[PDB]
């Protein structure tokens, strides 16, 4: 590839982060650009970075971002990396191939920031509504809020033992400070009524929390 990036990297909160984009031999001294991609935002121009390691950063790029080079390697450095720096970082390089401009982007490196302080999730569960039961359907709602960092795994149980038919989200609101997620277990009304309980169980960074719904309740 003209530009090689590992698809993922992780770093300890507040430590130094170092990302590598490697140019092929034919472009080994080229200047590259770094871009940052986060969900629900325009991609952001981060920096231009030369073969000798000189660089200029873009508009709204905090001073913790820096760059350096070694042979065909181009590095983006984030000093004291922060939760808000989680992102896909992509390198790019332009060139001329017969009088025609070409531009090539790396496949991106998805950066996660580990060792963040934890807030444990709050769960809110809702049984099927009267309206939905009348249609012979029963969707159990599990809403998961106020948690950090990103990322929970959720399992449903029927009568205190696990089950599959109920998937959920990727786990974000990278703004505010906290994150939100949800899971829905799609049942028939007969399945709802014919168990003693159901349980939404959430694991967050190895701690799990849970809340149950009981058909006898309503």
């Amino acid at each position: 590839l003209v530009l090689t990036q590992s698809s993922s990297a992780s770093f300890s909160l507040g430590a130094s982060a170092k990302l590598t984009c490697t140019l092929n031999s034919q472009h080994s001294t080229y200047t590259i650009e770094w871009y940052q991609q986060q969900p629900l935002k325009p991609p952001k121009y981060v920096m231009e970075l030369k073969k000798d390691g000189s660089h200029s950063t873009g508009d709204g790029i905090p001073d913790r971002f820096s760059g350096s080079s070694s042979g065909a390697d181009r590095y983006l450095l984030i000093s004291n990396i922060q939760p808000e720096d989680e992102a896909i970082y992509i390198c790019g390089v332009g060139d001329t191939i017969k009088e025609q401009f070409v531009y090539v982007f790396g496949g991106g490196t998805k950066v996660t920031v580990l060792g963040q302080p934890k807030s444990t999730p709050t769960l809110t569960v809702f049984p099927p509504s009267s309206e939905e039961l009348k249609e012979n359907k029963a969707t159990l709602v599990c809403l998961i809020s106020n948690f950090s960092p990103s990322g929970v795994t959720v399992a449903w149980k029927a009568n205190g033992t696990p089950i599959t038919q109920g998937v959920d989200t990727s786990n974000p609101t990278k703004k505010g400070n906290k994150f939100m997620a949800s899971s829905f277990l799609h049942l028939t009304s007969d399945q709802w009524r014919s168990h003693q309980s159901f349980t939404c169980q959430v694991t967050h960074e190895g701690d799990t929390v849970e809340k149950s719904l009981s058909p006898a309740l309503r």
């Binding site: 325009p42 991609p43 998961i144 949800s182």
Partner: protein, 218 residues
């Protein structure tokens, strides 16, 4: 102050056409060329080419010859991309991006426009109220919800009391399962405030429905 604002998501059958817009503000539109960049699910960025906003002349990368047209309305500072005879492999987020700035080619980006090429039909949501069984115990907080079930494509928007109720509120990300989206919003209010006072969720699916549901005790 450089801003590039793209039009909203599109859902289109194979063979059809789509035209998306990128509105530029904060600079002289005719001074910088506009690029287009494709990002297909599970692939990296692909540059498509650019349009010279002075001369009106577009240049396409070989992959995008034939059925892609960049055009301008310079009087509205707007660039357009039209994709004809849509293919499954055209499913992607399309970004516009403009140059700089010392031969920078991607200094400013739009937020992107998702074009889904699919035979899946547009499907409006079923909306259910999520309400406790009666008024709760004295001096408690009550959590109410709406379930927004089985819609396609994204998004829906949710408000409560037409936007006037915002303190309670959490609207969770959509979950995809089978070929359809489900989402929930919740609002937590003082037991003294509901049901004495009306609380209604308002759900819009811009293909082309709006559902209001007053939450009452089950």
């Amino acid at each position: 102050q450089i801003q590039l604002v793209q039009s909203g998501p599109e859902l289109k059958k194979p063979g059809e056409t789509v035209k998306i817009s990128c509105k530029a503000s904060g600079y002289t539109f005719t001074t910088y060329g506009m690029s287009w960049v494709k990002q297909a699910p599970g692939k990296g960025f692909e540059w498509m080419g650019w349009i010279n906003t002075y001369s009106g002349v577009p240049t396409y990368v070989d992959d995008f010859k034939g059925r892609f047209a960049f055009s301008l309305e310079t009087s509205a500072s707007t660039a357009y991309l039209q994709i004809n005879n849509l293919k499954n492999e055209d499913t992607a987020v399309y970004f516009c991006a403009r140059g700089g700035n010392n031969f920078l080619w991607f200094a400013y980006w739009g937020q992107g426009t998702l074009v889904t090429v699919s035979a899946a039909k547009t499907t409006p949501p079923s909306v259910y109220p999520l309400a406790p069984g009666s008024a709760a115990q004295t001096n408690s907080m009550v959590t109410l919800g709406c379930l927004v079930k089985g819609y396609f494509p994204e998004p829906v928007t949710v408000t409560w009391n037409s936007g006037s109720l915002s303190s309670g509120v959490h609207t969770f990300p959509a979950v995809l399962q089978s070929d359809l989206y489900t989402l929930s919003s919740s609002v937590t209010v003082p037991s003294s405030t509901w049901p004495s006072q009306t609380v209604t969720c308002n759900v819009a699916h811009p293909a082309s429905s709006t559902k209001v549901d007053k939450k009452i005790v089950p």
